[PDB]
Amino acid sequence: MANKAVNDFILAMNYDKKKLLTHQGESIENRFIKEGNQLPDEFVVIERKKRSLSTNTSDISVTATNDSRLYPGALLVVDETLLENNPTLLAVDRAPMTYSIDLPGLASSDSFLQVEDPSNSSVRGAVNDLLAKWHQDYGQVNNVPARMQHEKITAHSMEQLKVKFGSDFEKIGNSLDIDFNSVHSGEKQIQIVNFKQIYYTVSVDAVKNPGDVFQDTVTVEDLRQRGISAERPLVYISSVAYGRQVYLKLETTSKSDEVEAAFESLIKGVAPQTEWKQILDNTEVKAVILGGDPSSGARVVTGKVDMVEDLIQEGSRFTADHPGLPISYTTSFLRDNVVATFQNSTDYVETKVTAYRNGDLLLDHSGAYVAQYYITWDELSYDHQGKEVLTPKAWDRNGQDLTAHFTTSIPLKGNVRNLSVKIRECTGLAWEWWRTVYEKTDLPLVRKRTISIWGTTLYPQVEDKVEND
């Protein structure tokens, strides 16, 4: 008999489940460069470092909208196309199969769905008609909330993002306009956030015998004609989660330590602190929304930080006006019901940034004496190794005799280090010609420092005024 042979064919298969489901991303040699770059208002120090990301997961994120391959109980072939989340469907004559839907407020009597010929349209139709009946005795009367999961990552490379969010993420990533060259060059920090909102799940019970998914007319010949063997075995979709999904790009020009907490308060809808409000106002937002709204189709929006409140709560309620579309699914090996787990890894270059604000040094001389200034500092940069170089600098008027009223502003960029200022005045006394008015080394590079000198040859005075908000 055909079905017994098919049954025995599947049971006879031995394969390495781990090796079949492992994929290796791009290989980058180990590196570390420390680079300086001067922006208009700040000096940015950039550290690059080769890093690796690896994930082992059974949940497969859905980027498509109306994928007819991704129905509960669908048979998929285990090959490279499955690892790339673009699977080959085995669409042979299917036996009936019993499903269970999991949905708030439902006695396990209407939980089960018997579909005679499993396909996307037939499973779809069976679930949507049960839902239609669920709308009129629970959907509206009882308030039925969606189940929210969210995950985040700092964006560094698209290969990295694919390892985090799934192998077909670029369908999503291309629509977010992610500026990887700006994070690398050090003038942007980007976080990608994914919000899932699960309305309901449709699961398949364990398949007792592998032959139980095929009609009696399906032969070993038919399966081998479609390339099925121990080399390309079968899985079945054992569960599908339905709801709304949001991919959120947060891109800022700030170089702050507080960006994570700033973005986190917004994911949370928390009142922003003063250091974050700077960052949030310099944040751009792009979003891909995968339907919790009629119809099944991707919406790619851009906006302000203020949008994120609305994008998370829009389809947070499943009154089942419109059924959600697939947002993830899990597969299990037909042979033995072992859940298929996918191992993905990649190397990527991590960029971490540190900013140093530019500052001004102001001098006021209102004293009744000749003063001389000796202002020196080092300019920081990095050689092509990433090692520190300190080139010494000096104010062009150092040691010159200056008289009141003298004022000037010396612009000091963020790369200035070891700022030392010494001021002396000519007392006119043969026995004590010069007197030191001010002498400080390693002055903090505040936004604005005003060193004012006044008084007389005998009683000079000084003020060191800082403004650094």
Numbering used by the authors: 1 to 469
The paper states:
The key trigger of this dysregulated host inflammation is pneumolysin (Ply), a pore forming toxin belonging to the family of cholesterol dependent cytolysins (CDC), produced by all SPN strains. In addition to the extensive cellular damage resulting from pore forming activity on host cell membranes, Ply modulates host inflammatory and immune responses. Particularly noteworthy is the presence of a non-hemolytic variant (Ply-NH; encoded by allele 5) in serotype 1 ST306, one of the most successful pneumococcal clonal clusters. Ply-NH differs from wild type hemolytic Ply (Ply-H) by the presence of 4 substitutions (Y150H, T172I, K224R, A265S) and 2 deletions (ΔV270 and ΔK271).
In the present study, we demonstrate that although Ply-NH is able to bind and oligomerize on cholesterol containing membranes, it is unable to form pores. To decipher the molecular reasons behind loss of pore forming ability in Ply-NH, the crystal structure was solved (2.2 Å resolution) and was found to consist of 4 distinct domains, D1-D4. This is the first reported structure of a non-pore forming CDC. Monomers in the Ply-NH crystal were found to be tightly packed and this crystallographic arrangement resembles the monomer-monomer interaction interface that may form during formation of the pre-pore complex. Structural analysis of Ply-NH revealed that the Y150H substitution leads to repulsion between two positively charged residues (H150 and K286), which may destabilize Ply-NH’s pre-pore state, leading to loss of its pore forming ability. The I172 in Ply-NH is well defined in the electron density and is found to be located at the tip of TMH1. On the contrary, I172 in Ply-NH is found to be stabilized through the hydrophobic interactions involving the side chains of F169, L176, Y247, V288 and L290. The interactions from Y247, V288 and L290 might be essential to prevent the disengagement of these α helices joining β3 and β4, to form TMHs for membrane insertion and subsequent pore formation. Though individual mutations showed some gain of activity, the double mutant (Ply-NHH150Y+I172T) regained most of the hemolytic activity. This clearly implicates Y150H and T172I as the major mutations responsible for the loss of pore forming ability of Ply-NH, by preventing disengagement of α helices joining β3 and β4 and subsequent TMH formation. NBD-labelled Ply-NH derivatives: S175C and H184C (TMH1) and D257C and E260C (TMH2), however, failed to do so, confirming that the inability of Ply-NH to form pores is primarily due to the structural rigidity of D3, restricting the conformational change required for the formation of TMHs.
